[PDB]
Amino acid sequence: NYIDEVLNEVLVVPNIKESHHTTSNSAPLLDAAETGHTSNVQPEDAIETRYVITSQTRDEMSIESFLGRSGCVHISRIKVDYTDYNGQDINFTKWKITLQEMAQIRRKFELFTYVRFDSEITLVPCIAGRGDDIGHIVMQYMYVPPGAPIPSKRNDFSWQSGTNMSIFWQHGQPFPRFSIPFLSIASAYYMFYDGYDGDNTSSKYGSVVTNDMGTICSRIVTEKQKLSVVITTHIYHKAKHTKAWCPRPPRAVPYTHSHVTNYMPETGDVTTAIVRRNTITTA
Amino acid sequence: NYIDEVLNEVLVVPNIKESHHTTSNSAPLLDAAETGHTSNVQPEDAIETRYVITSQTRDEMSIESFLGRSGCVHISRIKVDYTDYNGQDINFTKWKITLQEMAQIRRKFELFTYVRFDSEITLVPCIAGRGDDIGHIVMQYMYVPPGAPIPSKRNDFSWQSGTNMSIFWQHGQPFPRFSIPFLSIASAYYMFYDGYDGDNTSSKYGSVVTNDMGTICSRIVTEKQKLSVVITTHIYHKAKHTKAWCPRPPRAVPYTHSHVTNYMPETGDVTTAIVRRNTITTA
Amino acid sequence: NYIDEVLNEVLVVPNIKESHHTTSNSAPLLDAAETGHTSNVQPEDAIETRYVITSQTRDEMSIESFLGRSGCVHISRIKVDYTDYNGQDINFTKWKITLQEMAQIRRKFELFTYVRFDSEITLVPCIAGRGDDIGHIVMQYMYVPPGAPIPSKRNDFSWQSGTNMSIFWQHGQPFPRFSIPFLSIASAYYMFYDGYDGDNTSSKYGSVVTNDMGTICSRIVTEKQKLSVVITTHIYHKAKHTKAWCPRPPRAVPYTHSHVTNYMPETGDVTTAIVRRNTITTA
Amino acid sequence: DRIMQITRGDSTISSDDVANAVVGYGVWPHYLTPQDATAINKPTQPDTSSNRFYTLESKHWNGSSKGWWWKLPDALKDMGIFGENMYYHFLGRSGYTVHVQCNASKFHQGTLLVAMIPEHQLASAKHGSVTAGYKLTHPGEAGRDVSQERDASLRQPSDDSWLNFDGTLLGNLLIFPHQFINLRSNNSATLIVPYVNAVPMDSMLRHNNWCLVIIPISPLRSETTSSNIVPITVSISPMCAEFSGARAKNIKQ
Amino acid sequence: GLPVYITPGSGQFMTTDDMQSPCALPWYHPTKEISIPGEVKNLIEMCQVDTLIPVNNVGNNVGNVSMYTVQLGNQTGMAQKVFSIKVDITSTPLATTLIGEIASYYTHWTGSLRFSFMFCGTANTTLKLLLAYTPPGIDEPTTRKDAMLGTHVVWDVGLQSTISLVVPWVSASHFRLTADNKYSMAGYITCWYQTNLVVPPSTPQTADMLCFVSACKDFCLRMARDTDLHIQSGPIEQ
Amino acid sequence: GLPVYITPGSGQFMTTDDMQSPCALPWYHPTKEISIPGEVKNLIEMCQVDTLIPVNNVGNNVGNVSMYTVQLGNQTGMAQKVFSIKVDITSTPLATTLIGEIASYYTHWTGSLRFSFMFCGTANTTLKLLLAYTPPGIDEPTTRKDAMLGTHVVWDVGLQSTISLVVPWVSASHFRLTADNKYSMAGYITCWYQTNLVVPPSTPQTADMLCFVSACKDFCLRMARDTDLHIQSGPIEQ
Amino acid sequence: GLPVYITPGSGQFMTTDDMQSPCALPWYHPTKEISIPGEVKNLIEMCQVDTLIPVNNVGNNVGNVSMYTVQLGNQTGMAQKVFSIKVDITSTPLATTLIGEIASYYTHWTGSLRFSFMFCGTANTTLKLLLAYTPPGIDEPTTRKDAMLGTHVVWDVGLQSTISLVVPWVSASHFRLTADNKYSMAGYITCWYQTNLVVPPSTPQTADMLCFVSACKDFCLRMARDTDLHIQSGPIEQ
Amino acid sequence: YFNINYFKDAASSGASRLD
Amino acid sequence: YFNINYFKDAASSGASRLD
Amino acid sequence: YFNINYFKDAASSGASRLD
Amino acid sequence: YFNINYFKDAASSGASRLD
Amino acid sequence: YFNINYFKDAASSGASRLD
Ligand SMILES: Cc1cc(CCCOc2c(Cl)cc(C3=NCCO3)cc2Cl)on1
Ligand SMILES: Cc1cc(CCCOc2c(Cl)cc(C3=NCCO3)cc2Cl)on1
Numbered sequence A, B, C: 001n002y003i004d005e006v007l008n009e010v011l012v013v014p015n016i017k018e019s020h021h022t023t024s025n026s027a028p029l030l031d032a033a034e035t036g037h038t039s040n041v042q043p044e045d046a047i048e049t050r051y052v053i054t055s056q057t058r059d060e061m062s063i064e065s066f067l068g069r070s071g072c073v074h075i076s077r078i079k080v081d082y083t084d085y086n087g088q089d090i091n092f093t094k095w096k097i098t099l100q101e102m103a104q105i106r107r108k109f110e111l112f113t114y115v116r117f118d119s120e121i122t123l124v125p126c127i128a129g130r131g132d133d134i135g136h137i138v139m140q141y142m143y144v145p146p147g148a149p150i151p152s153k154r155n156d157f158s159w160q161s162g163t164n165m166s167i168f169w170q171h172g173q174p175f176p177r178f179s180i181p182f183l184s185i186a187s188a189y190y191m192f193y194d195g196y197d198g199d200n201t202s203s204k205y206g207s208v209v210t211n212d213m214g215t216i217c218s219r220i221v222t223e224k225q226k227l228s229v230v231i232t233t234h235i236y237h238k239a240k241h242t243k244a245w246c247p248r249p250p251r252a253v254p255y256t257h258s259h260v261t262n263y264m265p266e267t268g269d270v271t272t273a274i275v276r277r278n279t280i281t282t283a
Numbered sequence D: 001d002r003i004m005q006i007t008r009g010d011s012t013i014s015s016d017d018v019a020n021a022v023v024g025y026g027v028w029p030h031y032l033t034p035q036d037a038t039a040i041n042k043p044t045q046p047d048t049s050s051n052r053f054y055t056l057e058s059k060h061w062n063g064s065s066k067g068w069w070w071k072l073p074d075a076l077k078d079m080g081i082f083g084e085n086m087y088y089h090f091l092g093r094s095g096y097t098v099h100v101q102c103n104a105s106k107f108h109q110g111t112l113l114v115a116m117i118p119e120h121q122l123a124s125a126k127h128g129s130v131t132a133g134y135k136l137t138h139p140g141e142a143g144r145d146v147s148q149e150r151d152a153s154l155r156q157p158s159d160d161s162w163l164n165f166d167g168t169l170l171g172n173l174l175i176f177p178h179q180f181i182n183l184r185s186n187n188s189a190t191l192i193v194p195y196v197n198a199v200p201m202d203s204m205l206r207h208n209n210w211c212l213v214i215i216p217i218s219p220l221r222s223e224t225t226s227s228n229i230v231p232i233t234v235s236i237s238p239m240c241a242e243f244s245g246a247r248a249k250n251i252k253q
Numbered sequence E, F, G: 001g002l003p004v005y006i007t008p009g010s011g012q013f014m015t016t017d018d019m020q021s022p023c024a025l026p027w028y029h030p031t032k033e034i035s036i037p038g039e040v041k042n043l044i045e046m047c048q049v050d051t052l053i054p055v056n057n058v059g060n061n062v063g064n065v066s067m068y069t070v071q072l073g074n075q076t077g078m079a080q081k082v083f084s085i086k087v088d089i090t091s092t093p094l095a096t097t098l099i100g101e102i103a104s105y106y107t108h109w110t111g112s113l114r115f116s117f118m119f120c121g122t123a124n125t126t127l128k129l130l131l132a133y134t135p136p137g138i139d140e141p142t143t144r145k146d147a148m149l150g151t152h153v154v155w156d157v158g159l160q161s162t163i164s165l166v167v168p169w170v171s172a173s174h175f176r177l178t179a180d181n182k183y184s185m186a187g188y189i190t191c192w193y194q195t196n197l198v199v200p201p202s203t204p205q206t207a208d209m210l211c212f213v214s215a216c217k218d219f220c221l222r223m224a225r226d227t228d229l230h231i232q233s234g235p236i237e238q
Numbered sequence H, I, J, K, L: 001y002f003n004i005n006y007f008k009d010a011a012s013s014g015a016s017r018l019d
């Protein structure tokens, strides 16, 4: 286990045996792909192979090393104000839970229909000094599940978190991180959906009727400062203890908007990664 | 234990067995609620149920995960002064122990008549820079039980704490936290009371005749600085190792004042969460 | 042990048994206090008691929880100078070991004739910014036993501590703490004394002929800075692994000076805590 | 079977019709144990002569009635023996039995909600931090409200029902030990209740542990002569009364 | 010493974490814990006790008590309808209820539920109502037949007095959200006359029925969150 | 190395914590600890030794010694009263007492207490006082009968000389506060004449009684706190 | 306490590290995990399923479907050539393929590969193509003879319909780079006519062949990296 | 990892258990 | 070094294993 | 957790015990 | 103190040994 | 607590012993 796990030799690939010639009836190279199945032909079948003892692990080819990597999924921003502190909808951020809200990683999952996981969340606040001294800028992140009082503005009553989670980070002390159970009323997170809100010819349809999990209302606790700032707290996300069901063809068209598939670009012709050739005859 | 405790499957709910029809005498659906007791009827009784093996824990429905969550119960503030340092009743805070001093969490307990617990106290000082440089602002929190010399002003003789508790926090070093035994001369904390100070038609009556536990006299040790500040040290509180006796109906009227039940708003009609319907016939 | 020690039930008090009436000869309530001894009478003796199983520990009533608590015993101060650095008797503190140098805690011991202990010393430097930037102000505390070169001024040769103890604290890094063996040539610390230096009708007499243990010469290593400061390094002290012999009546007169008993106030009549009554008849 | 018989002193009560009985928090009232105790003296325990069936002052059930309460440690501040032992001692401890009788005919329609409540800190009717007065949370056999009128100068509680007088939607009140008196099935209501309090024996004078409330939910409706009066009568029995901390004697108020 | 690496999360503070803290007040032996009749250990318990339902959720009624009774009337017509409420346990009239008030402390709910009704009528009086649970899928039924088609219980008013209607758990998602959500729509429950309210001579012809809701052993909640049903648009004084 | 997480409380300082610290002066072997007659181990011990009570807590008397004696007088009347003090052990005259002085170091107290009185009268002299403990509940009694009704002890002055009166523990809260509190009011103790002070010829007719208070094995304190009975409105010099 | 030394790396953050974190939402018991038909555990699986190849990688064709078919034609001449593509699995036409799309998530690839072709011709139709794998070393062959000299497979179109051509693994370095690299050049594969496409009367004379590529159990990847084949020259809205 | 009451007093400890 | 789930909950733990 | 005198000297140690 | 590969991977470890 | 030469080399270690 150790060795196998430390040496990373858990999932090893078979070796390529030796072959000889075959002047025989059964032709393995011939199958009818219309059966929708996949061929089973190998080196040893087609050629006069040798003998190679392999030693490549398919460890890094596991839904956990494919998925289990932290990725920017949101960049909370706060261009503070000292003029009006508090006021409605200010100096505090709120953002709806999700992804589809950002490619590269969105891309990645979408490779599967259903998915399930606990996550390694990490907050990377970066304090840009627009003043001659930033002081001590404390911070409060927290989670607002449904249906819950989402701060109208900066000091509601909801920042008491008498029964909510609020993580606090003060300049110097390291990046806040933490983790989380798999939050869904369903046995898995619906990375897609072919359902609607209802029969209302104006109902919602997508990944989304099924993902009302939150939002995040933010706060820079410290009170009024003299010299201004702007905070940019980056939100990274990692999938730990993941499972996946029914793979899908990757995405080749740059999306737009989340919780939707829509590609149809604003005017520009739909572009894809495929390159053009002069002729099939020369590559 | 582990698994059951790590998997959080300690308190599991029964499953819904299968039923068949009943053309029989005893009618479980009929009971007389006047007995003050509660009915005992189930799915299986009323319908022709199926068979569902459950898997929901009532773990998070425990007085410890209901109560055991940190909540703002006080926000100590100090608008420093450099003009007059010391002086009487300045630059040092003192506040009486309690709650009722702040909703959301006050609300929460009040759900029970009696309560008992040890607590996870955490101090979240936030230093607002009103100057061009905050220096090194050290801090001293401490606890003044009854009857004890409560600092008249900033440097008494009581800040020697020769036999008292004073926690010290210096800008950078993390949030001060600590904990505490259940402090009451009584076997439980009286979250209510129907008693008075005495027969004096001017005696006190409430939660409060029974809660003379303290106060907190504060201090910013550092001496005189140049560039001003304002400190806001937030006081969060968590209940660990809690017990509760005789549940009560929750509160629906926004209180006012603590250690009292009084709702009677200043003029405004007494408002409650109930919403109005046009008709009972349509919901 | 654990439970008993974690539950703090080490020293428990007896319970109050049940009594019945006594129409009998021997009168326990009658003893002659002139014997200098103390009566031995109890509830059960005097009344018709019931039966109460107790559960109060006399744990917190131990010379270790009575004594074992940190207390300000000195406040080293340094109003730096940049004009003349070094110079004689400057920018470096020195202070003689002791107490009597400060009440509340002085009070506390004095409750006993002799005492013995190892100590938990903690230094709480606080850097007051009198400048527009305090830089990096390093610090050197150290101990100068007798007879030893006590720094004449700031950089002697004694700050090399080739064989002395010097603890170093740099702004940010936490409070310096450490501890110490019981330092006395005697089997116990003389918290009092009825001896003198000699027959010289000008000899010394007190706690003090027996406590020539030190002094502390201080230093702010960093060199010359631009923007001034003032450092206030507070000295707290805790008694760990303590023993005490022959208790004494507490002090009721505010002292003056240390290593002496002297009360005789400057003019003011000697004041004590006792309050005056109009009449003995009503309390 | 519904019939019930109860015997407490030299007194007994019967009821040819009932809705079970209820034991508050499923605990039966009893005497204090040398474990949870604290005091040191031998408690006086009047048996029978004290913990017997005292009946209070009766009341009228109106179509305008709003509700009425009695505070227990207090309702018997006059009830012989118990209510003397109360005044002679500092510490008092005791549990009760509440027999609520209210009959009319099978041609009547009405519903009473009866409930006991541990520490029933009432709210003042006036905004502020002024707590209800002593003298008004200490009515006596007579009880309080009815739907009455009074000085607003008095640090007077809330005559307000729906808020529970404490400002908790009545209806959640069902959480406290209770039962109703649905004139179509019921006749009485029987509450039995142990001693609940963070202390082994409290002050029978300063502190009222149990508070009892009876509230008309569905208004009384007959078609008879309003010559037909349908009272409501409350009867109570200290149970396992125990006293101690003997001395002079307090004073009536 | 021990070559250590300080991990990302280090030094933070979470209003939701299990960690130890030096206890100030060392050597303190707390007051013993005497015995006290009735101690809770699980919200559930409170959730299984039927609390009364405001249903007469109508205008002037609302700030009063009546706001709790439902008078069963005349009804010239026949097969007419009484009331309706929707099941989404965080929806006035429900919400305020010991249950509702609670559920509003968690993000998700599940299991069956119990509705109980009581006749504060007369003795000589008689009636027969039909109560029904119309699962999520369509609109609260306009007519009885339409509603009788799904889950229901005919209630014969008699010497008993209390009929308890169960609300099975019908859902796609093992779990439902406590917060208003078109998806997690639990459905409606309604009540209608089966027969009438017949009263022999000189008995009133309107009477009330009280209604309640307690949980089922089915029941369970999760994901604690701060409540809905209470905005402290204070502060709070002294 | 060890992936560690630094917890909230970390780096703080508490005047009340049990932690180790590098000992400067390594390799030091402290002076042996010789044997010394009388060493304490518990405040309690000190609390069980009766210290004298200032009770003649009156005007000019107070700064002197007399402030300790209580002269038993003439008394033309009969059944007259001597003195009274209240039990709240942190209340002058009590307070200053070895006990009081102490208790004022803790927030809470409990158990029984012992009051002892001694006759510094004569030999040929005689008397009989009645001492009483009036538990918390009412007012310090104006009359003897009223006070005799509660806890008391008749004291026959004779060849003995010392009568010790116990103060049972009567309270609601297992524990009482050391600080003045209307709630935690312990009550009053008073003394009156049962008979008189009769003296045969040519003996003085006034004499004194000293009074004291030591603890009971009942006794116990908690929640250490800094004292009341001593304000260092100094400083302290050199 | 434990004399510890904080190591260099301490306090950092890596998008690639295995460490634990306090879980907010303590005591949460997640929805059970019901059974669901078809769950993956390894990219590999997806890599072994043959996905279709865009090869008609030509002009107007490209944005359409045709971009997938290869019509086998007339051919007046004989021994003429059909098409060619290069093996470097991250090279349009390959790239976009379930495999390619993937491989582009890792820095290195290895093993054998499988190309399969299918005749969407007719039944009465006949043909014989020669497919060949020209290992890395030289230029994609201009002529058949030259290409037939290396690895190949003659394909007899018949009642079967699918011929699968294996691409052995020939390389110096156990491993090849996924990124375009002159060194790690995998080679070319091409197809030519062996005979012709003969069709009896009144049958079309052009027909198509679809082509595919799935992996071999040989196969394996490593060094995960972010993809090539997708530039989010967005953002993404709402 | 558990039951390592790094601190002496009991009041200081994690959230209790369940049973 | 391993299997020392310093934290209670399971959701908090390292990347799972492989099998 | 206890008796781990991380330091050599005895003078350095926690508050003693009780007996 | 040793062989406590606090980290999973082998590439992360101290300087090897000698033999 | 002791003999835990957290470091490899011997030159790195506490003050020696006594004998
Ligand atoms: C699809 C999909 C993705 C997710 C994840 C939900 C978002 O997860 C977070 C939560 Cl619940 C809280 C926080 C957070 N709370 C305070 C700061 O950040 C961050 C994330 Cl990524 O759910 N369905
Ligand atoms: C009701 C009720 C609530 C409490 C808790 C008492 C307040 O607890 C605290 C104490 Cl004793 C001290 C400190 C504190 N000391 C220094 C800083 O904060 C904070 C709290 Cl919340 O007691 N009865």
Ligand SMILES: Cc1cc(CCCOc2c(Cl)cc(C3=NCCO3)cc2Cl)on1
Residues within 6 Å of the ligand: C097, C098, C099, C121, C123, C141, C142, C143, C167, C189, C190, C211, C213, C214, C216, C235, C236, C237
């Ligand atoms: C009486 C009596 C009290 C003491 C204690 C001696 C003072 O103890 C200290 C010593 Cl020896 C050194 C230091 C110290 N050295 C560098 C900084 O502080 C502090 C104290 Cl309190 O001895 N007899």
